[PDB]
Design a protein around this ligand. Sequence first.
Ligand SMILES: CC(C)CCC[C@@H](C)[C@H]1CC[C@H]2[C@@H]3CC=C4C[C@@H](OC(=O)CCC(=O)O)CC[C@]4(C)[C@H]3CC[C@]12C
Ligand SMILES: *[C@@H]1O[C@H](CO)[C@@H](O[C@@H]2O[C@H](CO)[C@@H](O)[C@H](O)[C@H]2NC(C)=O)[C@H](O)[C@H]1NC(C)=O
Ligand SMILES: *[C@@H]1O[C@H](CO)[C@@H](O)[C@H](O)[C@H]1NC(C)=O
Ligand SMILES: *[C@@H]1O[C@H](CO)[C@@H](O)[C@H](O)[C@H]1NC(C)=O
Ligand SMILES: *[C@@H]1O[C@H](CO)[C@@H](O)[C@H](O)[C@H]1NC(C)=O
Length: 823
Amino acid sequence: ANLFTKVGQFSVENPYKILITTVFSIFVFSFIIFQYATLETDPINLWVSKNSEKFKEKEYFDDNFGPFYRTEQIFVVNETGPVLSYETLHWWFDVENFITEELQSSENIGYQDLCFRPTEDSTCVIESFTQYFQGALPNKDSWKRELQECGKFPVNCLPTFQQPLKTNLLFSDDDILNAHAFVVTLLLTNHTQSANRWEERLEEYLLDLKVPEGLRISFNTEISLEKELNNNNDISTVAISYLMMFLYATWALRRKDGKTRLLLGISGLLIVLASIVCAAGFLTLFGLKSTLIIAEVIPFLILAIGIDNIFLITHEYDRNCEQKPEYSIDQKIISAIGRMSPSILMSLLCQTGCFLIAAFVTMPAVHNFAIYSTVSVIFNGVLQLTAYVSILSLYEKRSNYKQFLKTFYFKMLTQKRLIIIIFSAWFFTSLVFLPEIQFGLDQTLAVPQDSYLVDYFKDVYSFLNVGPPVYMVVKNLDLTKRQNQQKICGKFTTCERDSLANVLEQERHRSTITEPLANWLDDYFMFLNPQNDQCCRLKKGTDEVCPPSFPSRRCETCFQQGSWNYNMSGFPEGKDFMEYLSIWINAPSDPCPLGGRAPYSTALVYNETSVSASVFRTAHHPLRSQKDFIQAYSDGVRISSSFPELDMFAYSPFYIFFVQYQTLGPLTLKLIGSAIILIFFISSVFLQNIRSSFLLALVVTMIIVDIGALMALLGISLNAVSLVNLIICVGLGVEFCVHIVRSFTVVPSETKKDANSRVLYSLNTIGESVIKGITLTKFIGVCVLAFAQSKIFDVFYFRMWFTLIIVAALHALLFLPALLSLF
Ligand SMILES: CC(C)CCC[C@@H](C)[C@H]1CC[C@H]2[C@@H]3CC=C4C[C@@H](OC(=O)CCC(=O)O)CC[C@]4(C)[C@H]3CC[C@]12C
Ligand SMILES: *[C@@H]1O[C@H](CO)[C@@H](O[C@@H]2O[C@H](CO)[C@@H](O)[C@H](O)[C@H]2NC(C)=O)[C@H](O)[C@H]1NC(C)=O
Ligand SMILES: *[C@@H]1O[C@H](CO)[C@@H](O)[C@H](O)[C@H]1NC(C)=O
Ligand SMILES: *[C@@H]1O[C@H](CO)[C@@H](O)[C@H](O)[C@H]1NC(C)=O
Ligand SMILES: *[C@@H]1O[C@H](CO)[C@@H](O)[C@H](O)[C@H]1NC(C)=O
């Protein structure tokens, strides 16, 4: 507590060395940012913890079964009716073929060089209704009848890549002629930069595409999210915020006579700028990467809170001018610093601690923001206690100067009991609404409102009639043994009642994973059925695969009519299992439909003696909300635990982005609870009065509880961003109440020690400072976040922090005086 007085005392005696060091420190840090600063843009690096189980499972899936396809999805929409017409078919057939056959990317790399191919000799997989006709424009008359039958019976119109396409994948309505949209999905197995270049060319192509009148297209490339997420220009917004603060600072920092002090106003804002630069340049040396949050929020948050102590010290120093006039300018600043240091330091520590508590959230972008805010707040506090004190001493010495309201503080203290009843009811009403807070972070808010991804995300929720695929990865299961393979199959009478196939079939009518499971092990055993005389043919008298050109009577089935049984009697085991597995996983699907090459060539990781890992593919039903995604993620985790005897997990591409919600609620209670107890201990050490510290913590709890209830009423979902913002609201609320509580606790001997008198003296001392130096300054800092290009910075930052200011100010200015006079 005395180091601030010692630090401020050193600053007044050595202002130029402090000021020279400050600019030198700023210059070097700004140089580091200029040179070594890096911006993190990858969504996975921003939202996914590298140490999460889902991330590690994604690494295993990528290494063993390749990274999931790079998906480029296009929606073509007829908002007021059906989209299918020969005019639109003629247009899209030309556009669709150009994209996949003629759209070179520079480097002369097209779709054919990057597309997914089920087999090396197959064609590109294009998930579109144009593939029902093999990418050839149908007749002007028969396209309606042909398209309907193809939707009804996909097998009858198999595409050139031999994978049937269901209408729920290609359209918005199973009634194809009435569907308002049709979906086009492009899959790329290439994961090098050449794929990135082509997707950029594809993205530029679609933005410049002339859609027919009455139609509309939304799309998404694998690079779209990264490009759109980190595509913002808010330089003017920051300047506007700092100009409004400059105008307010000039008015607030003018002398009691009414004379403006421009240097003090400018210096206070320059110190805020230095705090951001010094923190950003400091964290660069540690290799920390900034993100969109740093560019879009940090200048506003630090501006909102980095200017408060300037008013508190200057206003207190102004008070030291009228009171104790014989004191010199140096002594006035030191005395003002000394008495206001305990409240400033305690609030600073609460700000520091809450940010560090918010750093326990594992989202790197959110964790990065908390760490950046922690350094900025510490840098801001040091600068205010050294740089501003040096400037204030320099300015005041050079410019020598000779020098509602209280009525409300009495009228409101007449309604102490009524005030407590109003706020007590508000807190109790708020508790009822806490269970009503919704989880999630809508993706439309994350991207700029003008982005083309906003339309695409709406189209997915509106028109996509399929859900993300789910892969059941089973590893280290010795499938050469009958017992182990009985734990997977579901087509045979000896398979366990709780086998992978059996259990998952039950979940189809009980969970979000409602699609049939592609069981390769069942297909492999079905492929061995002697009834399938065209499957598993061996040269007679030899254990060699029958050549496809070989005619009948020159080969024999791997199994005789009496060996294969539906109770798995005679099924291959040991080395025989792997012997015929090579035959099955290489057989084409043309003569034998049960051949596992096309469907399961990449579904198995194996060698000549064992299958080390394998994949069983299913999918969720269409997920059309944050609740659906959270429930879908919950189902995957729950089902993975349904097989304690299997080293297995469920993989979906979106799982990494919804890890937090599995434990968000318990984490919110733990982190916010930890923050409030931290307030109690920090307050107790400084206030040295557990009663006052308890009431301060109690009031902060009511503010946070009320904010949480208002989040439910205001439609602010709970996620990593909201949780950290709400954790910051804990620190922000403390600053609203710390000075009121401390002034009540410590009063001069001249004033009466009565509780009512102490509350009045507190309101007649810093009540103005709380309004001018905390409340109004906070609003100006974050007000422009309401107009941010991305609605996340308005929904989850402005709305929460704007609500914090109102709720905290009401509790600090009305309830807290009543809660102090009584109790
Ligand atoms: C630096 C600040 C601005 C935070 C950045 C966080 C984003 C990288 C996160 C927040 C919400 C996330 C989204 C939440 C939900 C989804 C849906 C889900 O997508 C699918 O299942 C595919 C089909 C569909 O889009 O519905 C997974 C990706 C996505 C877009 C997520 C992508 C990553 C996002 C945009
Ligand atoms: C991703 O696509 C690139 C092409 O853009 C492939 O790289 C080519 O590979 C061939 C054969 O090795 C070379 O002759 C070309 O010079 C490469 N071109 C470029 C631009 O690098 C790459 O193989 C693809 N990725 C995978 C996994 O197949
Ligand atoms: C879009 O829907 C309206 C509603 O019937 C329809 O009249 C119009 O033709 C559609 N657009 C196209 C390009 O067909
Ligand atoms: C499996 O079925 C065959 C005939 O269908 C029968 O001979 C055999 O005993 C059955 N297996 C077992 C373990 O009973
Ligand atoms: C096959 O893979 C298994 C599991 O990884 C391993 O234990 C075994 O040594 C491998 N055998 C050969 C011949 O590669």
